[PDB]
Amino acid sequence: KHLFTSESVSEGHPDKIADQISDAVLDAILEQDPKARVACETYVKTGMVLVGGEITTSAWVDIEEITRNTVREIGYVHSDMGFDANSCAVLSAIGKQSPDVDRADPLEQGAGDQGLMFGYATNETDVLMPAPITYAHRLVQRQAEVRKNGTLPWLRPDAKSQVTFQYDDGKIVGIDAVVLSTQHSEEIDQKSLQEAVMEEIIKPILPAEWLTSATKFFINPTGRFVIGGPMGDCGLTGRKIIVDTYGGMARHGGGAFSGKDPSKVDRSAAYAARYVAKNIVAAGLADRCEIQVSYAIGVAEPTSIMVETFGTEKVPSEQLTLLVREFFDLRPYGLIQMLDLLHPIYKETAAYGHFGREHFPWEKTDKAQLLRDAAGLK
Amino acid sequence: KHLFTSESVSEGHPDKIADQISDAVLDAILEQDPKARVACETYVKTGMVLVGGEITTSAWVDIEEITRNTVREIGYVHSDMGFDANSCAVLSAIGKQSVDRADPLEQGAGDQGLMFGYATNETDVLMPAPITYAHRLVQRQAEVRKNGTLPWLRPDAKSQVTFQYDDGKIVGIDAVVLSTQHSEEIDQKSLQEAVMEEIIKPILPAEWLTSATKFFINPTGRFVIGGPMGDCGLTGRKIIVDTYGGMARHGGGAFSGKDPSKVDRSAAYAARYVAKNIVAAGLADRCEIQVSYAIGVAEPTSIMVETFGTEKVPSEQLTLLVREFFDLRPYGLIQMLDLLHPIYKETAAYGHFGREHFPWEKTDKAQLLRDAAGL
Amino acid sequence: KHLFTSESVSEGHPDKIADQISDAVLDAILEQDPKARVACETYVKTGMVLVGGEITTSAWVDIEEITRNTVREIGYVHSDMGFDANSCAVLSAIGKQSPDVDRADPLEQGAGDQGLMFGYATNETDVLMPAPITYAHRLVQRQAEVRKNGTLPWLRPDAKSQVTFQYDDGKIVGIDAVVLSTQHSEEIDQKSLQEAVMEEIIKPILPAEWLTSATKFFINPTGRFVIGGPMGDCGLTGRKIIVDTYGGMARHGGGAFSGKDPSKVDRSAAYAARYVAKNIVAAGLADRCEIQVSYAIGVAEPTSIMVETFGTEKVPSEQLTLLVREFFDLRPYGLIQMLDLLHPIYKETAAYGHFGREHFPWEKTDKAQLLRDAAGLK
Amino acid sequence: KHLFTSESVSEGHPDKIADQISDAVLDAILEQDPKARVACETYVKTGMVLVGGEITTSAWVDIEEITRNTVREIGYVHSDMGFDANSCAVLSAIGKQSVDRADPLEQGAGDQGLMFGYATNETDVLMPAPITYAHRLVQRQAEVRKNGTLPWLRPDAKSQVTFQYDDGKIVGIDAVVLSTQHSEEIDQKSLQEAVMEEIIKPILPAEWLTSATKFFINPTGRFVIGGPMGDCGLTGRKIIVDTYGGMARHGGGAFSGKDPSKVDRSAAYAARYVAKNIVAAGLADRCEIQVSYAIGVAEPTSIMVETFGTEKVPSEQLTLLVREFFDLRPYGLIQMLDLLHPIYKETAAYGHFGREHFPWEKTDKAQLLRDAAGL
Ligand SMILES: [Mg+2]
Ligand SMILES: [Mg+2]
Ligand SMILES: [Mg+2]
Ligand SMILES: [Mg+2]
């Protein structure tokens, strides 16, 4: 009764490979040119990586070297896994300055595109993130954690996890269903896999107080999982946008993050929307907070700002919407200054979630105390 | 009071070109082989279309002809438009991906995943107003482009509508954005007036248009370079304009290029089918259905019914009626909606949800649901 | 004094890989549709095979399956060699009927393109082929022979050989220089390689009566040769046309063979030119014979026929040119009937030479006795 | 009596587009880095250009801009022509391939291979007549295309000339083939007359044109679809039209896309340099030079001089003079011909041999060779 489900994928999933390659290229460019315009779309298939899009930068980068290193760190170094970073093909289809100061104050620059973006936060977890997506992320990051340190050496990078939570009036009741399918080598059978996944992955993550005898567990439910990654499966950037955000707990505007420089409101505004939502919840102004911002191309001011507090607000929501508008610069290049986004920090974001990890700029809660006593509280 | 905003793109938008090419390949395979497994990802860039993925089927089909015909119908037929269906490159990287149930209806889900369905009586088609009219703006744009009413504009186009709600009720439209590609023969002033008279005003109801409504028509000026040139399009990059424009939640699954055995597409269609029939039955004003699946499991791992307080009958009675009247098993909803037919290129532009001629948009269960509930 | 040199490459050379893939696709199509028009150009790079061109056929073929099988038979099945047929990328860019009975007698059809083609034959060897290219071919085919039967298991497919012959008035004097560079594994050093190449490759091919103490031998002259094949080296069809023919001993028209159906005069006319030249020499009418034919598009009769007998003719060369014109149908679709070319026999030709192997139709000498007593001899 | 035939293609022929793109990339790298190692293979097809190979250089260069500029200068700038430099796809698959001699001139050959050079006093440029005038026909075609004399014809074009010889002496021209791409505005009759008056007659000497000369002008009719569309072009697929049109033998090495350290290109240029100076010195009427190289060896493994009986001095004296006056070592002929300069896009169409403004076409050794021989 009253259940919610969220899924996640590891860094070896072909979609996440394309996300990591895109942001890897972005980080390389930003390391030389912080003001660069980057729109990098990566296509990864069996034996192939296609890196395309449009960049406008003074930087000079090696797309092949960046791509091979990124796949090499993911762990695809051998043809027995279905993909090898040293022998795969790397093709490039990157165009330059698309024929487009304009503004006396750079912060007043209009948006580069239209679109809608969402941010979310909930005091369910320590990191102000929804439980299902948080623990789904932690399962697949542990699977890579135990593959990379040699604990379970038979694991291969491609993996997917899914956690179904039972809810009762916003109260986290427990876990009703766990799904975890991981790619593996020939050095293990399915019965030893289902037991090793329980002991080395699921147990050090899902709190024992949420697992009962009724919790359905599906570990490699179809059996053998040896062929994976780009082998026999396509990977495109921007095909895991719900995994990259809130696992379905919150709504989405449709924009991908990876391969996009901070001037692309699809990424920066979504990070800022998370920044507002986390600070509103961290300030104690709501238990759950979702905000939507939208933009029109060539318009600096957001065309709409909605603050949704699902009955959890500790102050009228009209007051919340005004607090958002004055304590945060939601203008495109205002986001960049507010979050200090012109740095090569994005290859790390393309993997196990863009949110919930406290060292990102959009995850710091330096505005919570300000919002708290600005709304007159304690 | 609050504002909500949704967007849509024309059939000429690069991401939507990829979606249509992926479903055009799908339709041509289903026409010969209705039980085909197809997972077709399309990548469109300046001068080329890359059609890839995994396909296992007994159908023989010409990817080049399908791709060229699709782009041709979309409208890119000249180098002056930035893309030409008769001279672009078409590369294929399609592979063949490498009998368990006595009843095919009991087959387990091909993959895990969560899907959402939504419905709301804001509009006649039981869809959210922002996404609905965002679709009708870009669809009207293509309409007046193809019938020669405005011959000077080009396929690539984007729309965005900002609605104002007073706690569930539509009060009007706050902001309208329409950006359309065009040729050199037209100036921006005559362009703005033409899309205001032929595109915007015939689509948005005059009751929602006030003097405070903002109209952004080609806000940055000339829009000559468009489509696959200057940008880049990939299948499944418009999943929110495909569904409910952000009004409802989304599981993360793309639609185009996937046969009905993929729960990412099929279960979302079914989730819309149940949500729409619930709202059409008067059981709720707004309704969101969440379905979750586990790979190898036929029964959904979760079925959530959220009615946002608009529940006209008890919520437990709603979740029960969903299980009674709807078969949400992977191959059960294929038979419930008759999905093994080439009918998917139509869905790849202007929204998968909202057009009553689709199987998941039929309300043939509405009177049944209303009877089993009371009145 | 008076030296001549010719080179050859093995079936693992990236250029020969593209030739084999092209003809493999051609054979597959001809096996279903003998009348098919095929123009298949293959591009093979690290981790990638691109198969393009124009085909017009009722056949339905699997380009990916044909490509992987062809590379699999060549021996690239592992990423340690630099290329794997199971995990590489296969892309296709094949167009259909390019918008082009026409003739009451099909044999009178005009040529599909212009161009020039050469054929050659010399009684130096048993197979009426020049010695240098023949023995250069035999060296690299032996290298694959000893790699495939497990004799020298450390060999990798990519290999190149080159033989310099000393001549004295057409008399084969001996061998002055041998070059043989073969790709190898880590299971051998360079000194053991240079000795094993001598014992297992060079010795059972080059006759001992042609090797002196002055014969320069260059076996892996640069040393270690571990990275090869498509890895770090491009391969295109039609980039080994001199290896495919007479090793430079004879002239060439410029046309590639592989991937072209027999209606393409670049291939069929060259095979027929070899057919004429071999029969002229086999009939005893000349010791060395080179013929050139040329075509104009839409013209059935060759625009020119030259019979060059380098002072070796046993009958006036004017008479030879007339004998050629009446004992051979050099019209495009006359070649096809004369040589019975509408069969899938071409994947075998894309490797160690299109000539010199007696089981090919253009290599049979069923017209020699006819030419001999037609010119009035014995 | 005998007939000999050679062919040539225009700068718009698909194989030649690939050769020019490969050398345009080469020229732009040499302009910044003269000692760069580049091996650039280009693949042109309907709507796309794939530029691949192995390159190690300190130069930063824009493959897209170089490719688009090259095709643009070639003439494909509209979809009606079948290819457009401003909207085609440009993919790059270039890698970096993964200090031994005290004197750089003593470096060993980067690869094995045999190369041929040729020269004959049949023409003023000391080239075989069939290939020479085959080049001048397609070059005249582009000439009258670009200066607006005939604006209706398009870049793709092929020529072929059949010469008749009476044992070494030119007697005339037997057959002329000229096929040129064109637009729809022109009919085949007016096309045949126009290329006869503006292309063929201004190029082929009237002494060689009789009433028995065959003229095949667009022999199959309309030639509208051309260039990369309908066909397919690869670097190094025109090695015989690049050199001597079949009159001389060929080693098998392609030219375009290769820096001067590649003996396939460099030694062939040098072999032409020696053959031309020998013929220009009056030492022979026809001369063919064969040079062979072993990888890692600086001295050529073979140097053959064939004069076809036209030797005006003893043949042993000729082979000696070649070794005395020419440095045929891999990096020796780079310095002998000053090859480390961006001068190679010019060679990628209309013949590498024949145009006196190239380094390997200079006859600065002719008087020297004649002195050291006698007179
Ligand atoms: Mg995917
Ligand atoms: Mg997009
Ligand atoms: Mg090569
Ligand atoms: Mg060609």
mmCIF file of C-alpha atoms and ligand atoms in Angstrom, chain C residues 13 15 233-236 239-240, chain D residues 41, ligand 3:
data_model
loop_
_atom_site.group_PDB
_atom_site.id
_atom_site.type_symbol
_atom_site.label_atom_id
_atom_site.label_comp_id
_atom_site.label_asym_id
_atom_site.label_seq_id
_atom_site.Cartn_x
_atom_site.Cartn_y
_atom_site.Cartn_z
ATOM 1 C CA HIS C 13 47.268 -6.290 -43.609
ATOM 2 C CA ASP C 15 44.307 -2.914 -46.768
ATOM 3 C CA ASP C 233 46.850 1.783 -39.367
ATOM 4 C CA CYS C 234 44.135 2.501 -41.919
ATOM 5 C CA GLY C 235 42.906 -0.008 -44.454
ATOM 6 C CA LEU C 236 41.018 0.808 -47.649
ATOM 7 C CA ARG C 239 45.158 0.338 -52.000
ATOM 8 C CA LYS C 240 47.101 -2.813 -52.973
ATOM 9 C CA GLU D 41 43.015 8.795 -45.528
HETATM 10 MG MG MG E 3 47.687 1.536 -47.002
#
